[PDB]
Structure 1
């Protein structure tokens, strides 16, 4: 019956409020002032909340769910009846927790040091990011990109190989087929009769909406390649892909660090009102006051009068240990705060709006039951925050508040500058996100065995994104585990849906405020219909299916892409003109190392009859060591030098069933050096008889393609 569930919820709603309030107060008091008693004052309060939640979870199972018809209590119980990871055995949970902690620390404190001076090692955040985001030297960037993976990625292979399995078990004990089908469980609704959505439909929607972004991404790619062919000459072909270590960071997630090399008009600086914020004597308070005034203009409430004294708006005067990462806090019981150290730049001027967006969203659904105070799904909370910072930094609004003199006019060159600087960050990160999430889904469900991970990875990299690797990685590395989200067990699909919801909201709101020009000059200030449309959706929360809450603003049922293309038109009609001569697209056969390599072909039966051994990887080890010895002997007996080659300076690629592959050689400890093809040919002509005798082949079974036997 329903009365019992209603009363049970009536008691839980009254306990959770106070328990959560105290738990959050402890953490605020720690974060505001770091000491060694605050951590102990906070950990116990957090443990209390965890214990209470687990107890009430295990208690709430006494009610059969399929008898309830009130949608609200149905959703609440469904959100409380969940089970989590407390379904495995005990020692299995211990093993999983140990694996997760080990991966986290390995990522946090790894080191690499210079082969020249082995007494100086560098970490990831201070120094490696600097080398990768500031340098312009090919060899240093190659060293940095290779060493991080070669020294840290390997340590993470045998741990991931267990993590997967364990998580799959934990998922299959909860009536899910795998872990990916467990992560796709947020975009799911049932029983609204016209507003449904299944778990398998998200995949098809993603794959069907991606294929309309390729015509713009291809032109952007071709332009960036034609502009990089000037800063690294003789390293990039005009019909190939881009080497993976010339993008702007360790992975290539954002392209926003190529802007200095890619300005369309380098003699026209963009708008930056910073000196006007120091010649007019603007302190911290005035920024937040202007933000509040902007939010008031559209028809939204004031602040709470307890927000002005309880918050912490600026760094403490004394040098006080207090982490500063700008956040918005919803403590509970009508309490809202902000935490940041406000400098005086336009950067913080925009960050203030972006942060106050979260507070204005939180103040809206505070009338809902306790368990239903979230966003509609993972993408709403950040899109609602970002459509404000998008419409706060226009030249019109900037000139109306009094930071730009009215003598300022607009030239379309500055327009193109701004649009490209935005595109390099918005469009550059969609292919990477799509590729990564696709690979993870396919690995979790089972369509890729444990010996083809790092092959499908680098095929999907060339096929979708258009990026090639500079050095062949065999099946011992682990490249996707050198990213924060993959080794710390987080989801990655929200970064794709947020970027569509953002522009959908923007185009839906710029139509109620009666805009007339292009979509990127729009503004929603001095409006009263846009504010009401937005507030008619903020006040819902999770008490409604997200696919209906989306319709109360736009007027559709699913995510669409055309609003994102209408935003980027004046850049499309300019890239289409600039790419008249170059070749638009790429070919997946080039490689930065496939011109100093030699091809080897082996035929065993023809030589050995019905006695030929089988060709495992120990024979590959023997082959590599034999070639290293040959190189040693040639250098000694011709060039009168003494260089110590090894069995790891011979790189092998493209292994096939009829034994045939490519290889090339590299200096002892300098990955960016390559012994040319001619010297390797001379060195192999001289010692071929011994390489043949080591294997029992006779100059017709072991063929080096290009080296013709004469003696």
Structure 2
């Protein structure tokens, strides 16, 4: 029978796959920790063998017909195996698409904007332009950096995007999808028992529904940021107008976290930073991870493995091997869980350690599941589980409990307000940019936006949705979205929006589980075993079950809800309402200085 044949095929596949995946992951780890040509070539062969085996099994797996398979776990495993992805196209088209992707990656990596009238001062984005966007207050210098990177990247990348869209559309149609946007929206599709069914088309409307609720809080935050920037820039920003694109603290306006010194509510009150306390008590990276482990055992999640302590790097090696700075959690397979982070003794690294340990705990929980189902429920869930631990770790209760913060510390309203504003600038601000960018990409892939009117649509939506106006008019020869890293390197962007919704939903569910009676932002889930079990029920599942079922398992709801996000930011929302009474909340679509 077909189902029994699929079961035997999956049983043979899991044993062969786990070994090959472990070899590929180990070679990738060996390259990441010890960057060299030989580790890179070894990684290349390991990835080549694993990819060739995976495609060969996928081709055999496509022979099976899903109609006569009744059991959901086998059907889900076959669905995961049968996703050809880019292999659906012919060799010529696949090679052309790969060439376009590689040239896009190299050109973005090597992007150059240089000073007019000062030829020697030519700047790359990664070493210096980002520093200019984060720190510089000069209007003309920011206008130069933004316009120059926009001009060079957009003019070079507009044809490449023009055929990139067509090739991705061909690949998606070849994989029985309406467009590349539907192919991306497939990741949130859940097929399961009645009432748990989720559709790709549904996701757009769900995002819009969440956005409408988020929009008053964003409007108040935008008005407050606009007033503070107006204080910083006296005549270049209008009270009723949109914000200029180059004054948002980032190259693209993705994160507003760099506007915190300009937009601080209370300058006099210090931040909750505990780096100096760590310095005084002689803390190190090992102690940071041990404290994170103490938090995870205290909440009731399992202890870290011996292999994790033995094999991971938690410090810069300083023995002559180059490393990647970025913290990454690795699930190599066969019970091997590692973290690569060059941890300095700072508060940010402490929160990052909690986030990566959350990733490792999420990976550890679903190890029981079969190989094809050892993943997150969706892209958002994996990031969200780490983010809730990062949220809980930063609370004053957690810092006081572990002795980082003094026992006699007084929590006034003002520190809560400025901390919440910083959290909003990092978290609330990114949501309109993410929604607008994903909506633009979906409509471009769909063909709803005409080919020759692309730029004209994008700025309008930024005026409509983000409330950010272009500093200078851009015609259609520009490709203004393509300056972002995620779009130029073929990455989905809606995961951050889903991550943001899931993070607050999970945090409220755990706080209700832990019987916390106070404000959501001050909540700590330490020493609440029932909350750990409630979380672990979702963590064990992986993607064996539909993501709606896992969401119901944690929060009791089957869809995205932004009421926890509003509940988290409620004191800040009240404060922003209190201070915006004289001012005008909202923006005008037409360009206002």
Match of 1:550 in 2: 551
* Pair 1:324 & 2:325 matched: yes
Question: How has the CA–CA distance of structure 1 residues 17 and 263 changed in structure 2, closer, same or farther, with 3 Å as cutoff?
Answer: same
* Pair 1:563 & 2:561 matched: no
1:27 Cα offset (Å): 1.5
Could you list the per-position Cα deviations for residues 248-290 of structure 1 after superposition, in whole angstroms to 9, with x for gaps in the alignment? Answer: 1211111111111111111111222222212222223222211
Match of 2:189 in 1: 188
Runs of 4+ deviating beyond 3 Å:
none
Partner SS, residue 324 of structure 1: coil
* Pair 1:334 & 2:335 matched: yes
Distance in 1 (alpha carbons) for counterparts of 2:47 and 2:590: 55
1:3 Cα offset (Å): 2.1
Match of 1:443 in 2: 444
Query: Which shows bigger deviation, 221-230 or 315-324?
Result: 315-324
Match of 2:156 in 1: 155
Matches within 5 A, 1:647-686: none
* Pair 1:95 & 2:96 matched: yes
Query: Which shows bigger deviation, 280-289 or 429-438?
Result: 280-289
Could you list the per-position Cα deviations for residues 27-48 of structure 1 after superposition, in whole angstroms to 9, with x for gaps in the alignment? Answer: 1122221223222222112111
Could you list the per-position Cα deviations for residues 467-504 of structure 1 after superposition, in whole angstroms to 9, with x for gaps in the alignment? Answer: 11121111211101111111111111111111111111
Partner SS, residue 67 of structure 2: helix
* Pair 1:428 & 2:451 matched: no
Could you list the per-position Cα deviations for residues 430-478 of structure 1 after superposition, in whole angstroms to 9, with x for gaps in the alignment? Answer: 1111111111111111122221111111111111111111211112111
Distance in 1 (alpha carbons) for counterparts of 2:78 and 2:297: 37
Distance in 2 (alpha carbons) for counterparts of 1:12 and 1:171: 26
Match of 1:414 in 2: 415
* Pair 1:487 & 2:488 matched: yes
Could you list the per-position Cα deviations for residues 647-706 of structure 1 after superposition, in whole angstroms to 9, with x for gaps in the alignment? Answer: xxxxxxxxxxxxxxxxxxxxxxxxxxxxxxxxxxxxxxxxxxxxxxxxxxxxxxxxxxxx
Matches within 5 A, 1:69-84: 69-84=70-85
Match of 1:671 in 2: none
Question: How has the CA–CA distance of structure 1 residues 213 and 284 changed in structure 2, closer, same or farther, with 3 Å as cutoff?
Answer: closer
Partner SS, residue 329 of structure 2: strand
Query: Which shows bigger deviation, 61-70 or 325-334?
Result: 61-70
* Pair 1:222 & 2:223 matched: yes
Question: How has the CA–CA distance of structure 1 residues 18 and 590 changed in structure 2, closer, same or farther, with 3 Å as cutoff?
Answer: closer
Could you list the per-position Cα deviations for residues 561-589 of structure 1 after superposition, in whole angstroms to 9, with x for gaps in the alignment? Answer: 11111111111221111112112222222
Match of 2:262 in 1: 261
Match of 1:304 in 2: 305
In the alignment of these two chains, the number of paired residues is 592
Partner SS, residue 503 of structure 1: helix
Distance in 2 (alpha carbons) for counterparts of 1:448 and 1:405: 57
Partner SS, residue 511 of structure 1: helix
Residues 23 and 45 of structure 1 are in contact (CA less than 8 Å); yes or no, is this contact kept in structure 2?
Answer: yes
1:191 Cα offset (Å): 4.3
Residues 535 and 554 of structure 2 are in contact (CA less than 8 Å); yes or no, is this contact kept in structure 1?
Answer: yes
Partner SS, residue 591 of structure 2: coil
Matches within 5 A, 1:296-695: 296-592=297-593
Distance in 1 (alpha carbons) for counterparts of 2:236 and 2:53: 61
Distance in 1 (alpha carbons) for counterparts of 2:590 and 2:175: 45
Distance in 2 (alpha carbons) for counterparts of 1:590 and 1:336: 52
Partner SS, residue 452 of structure 1: helix
TM-score (norm 2): 0.97
Distance in 2 (alpha carbons) for counterparts of 1:462 and 1:61: 46
Distance in 2 (alpha carbons) for counterparts of 1:190 and 1:493: 20
Match of 2:179 in 1: 178
Partner SS, residue 211 of structure 1: helix
| Consecutive unaligned residues in structure 2, runs of 5 or more | none
TM-score (norm 1): 0.81
Residues 240 and 592 of structure 2 are in contact (CA less than 8 Å); yes or no, is this contact kept in structure 1?
Answer: no
Partner SS, residue 306 of structure 1: helix
Residues 387 and 506 of structure 1 are in contact (CA less than 8 Å); yes or no, is this contact kept in structure 2?
Answer: yes
Residues 299 and 528 of structure 2 are in contact (CA less than 8 Å); yes or no, is this contact kept in structure 1?
Answer: yes
Could you list the per-position Cα deviations for residues 122-168 of structure 1 after superposition, in whole angstroms to 9, with x for gaps in the alignment? Answer: 11111111222211112111111111112221011111111111211
Matches within 5 A, 1:283-298: 283-298=284-299
Partner SS, residue 582 of structure 1: coil
Question: How has the CA–CA distance of structure 1 residues 590 and 28 changed in structure 2, closer, same or farther, with 3 Å as cutoff?
Answer: closer
Partner SS, residue 552 of structure 1: helix
Distance in 2 (alpha carbons) for counterparts of 1:317 and 1:196: 52
Residues 243 and 470 of structure 1 are in contact (CA less than 8 Å); yes or no, is this contact kept in structure 2?
Answer: yes
Two-structure CA RMSD over aligned residues (Å)? 1.5
Partner SS, residue 330 of structure 1: strand
1:189 Cα offset (Å): 2.4
Match of 2:281 in 1: 280
Distance in 1 (alpha carbons) for counterparts of 2:506 and 2:528: 15
Partner SS, residue 240 of structure 1: coil
Match of 2:127 in 1: 126
Match of 1:242 in 2: 243
Distance in 2 (alpha carbons) for counterparts of 1:525 and 1:87: 48
Question: How has the CA–CA distance of structure 1 residues 194 and 136 changed in structure 2, closer, same or farther, with 3 Å as cutoff?
Answer: closer
Distance in 2 (alpha carbons) for counterparts of 1:83 and 1:580: 55
Partner SS, residue 338 of structure 2: strand
Match of 1:270 in 2: 271
| Consecutive unaligned residues in structure 1, runs of 5 or more | 593-711
1:81 Cα offset (Å): 2.4
1:21 Cα offset (Å): 1.4
Residues 470 and 591 of structure 1 are in contact (CA less than 8 Å); yes or no, is this contact kept in structure 2?
Answer: no
Match of 1:146 in 2: 147
Pick the structure with greater CA Rg: 1
1:334 Cα offset (Å): 1.4
Distance in 1 (alpha carbons) for counterparts of 2:226 and 2:62: 59
Structure with the larger helix share: 2
Distance in 2 (alpha carbons) for counterparts of 1:315 and 1:509: 35
Partner SS, residue 336 of structure 1: strand
Distance in 2 (alpha carbons) for counterparts of 1:28 and 1:508: 35
Match of 1:50 in 2: 51
Distance in 2 (alpha carbons) for counterparts of 1:512 and 1:498: 21
Partner SS, residue 331 of structure 1: strand
Residues 299 and 529 of structure 2 are in contact (CA less than 8 Å); yes or no, is this contact kept in structure 1?
Answer: yes
Distance in 1 (alpha carbons) for counterparts of 2:191 and 2:277: 54
Match of 1:705 in 2: none
Distance in 2 (alpha carbons) for counterparts of 1:192 and 1:100: 39
Question: How has the CA–CA distance of structure 1 residues 146 and 317 changed in structure 2, closer, same or farther, with 3 Å as cutoff?
Answer: closer
Residues 33 and 321 of structure 2 are in contact (CA less than 8 Å); yes or no, is this contact kept in structure 1?
Answer: no
Query: Which shows bigger deviation, 302-311 or 497-506?
Result: 302-311
Partner SS, residue 88 of structure 2: coil
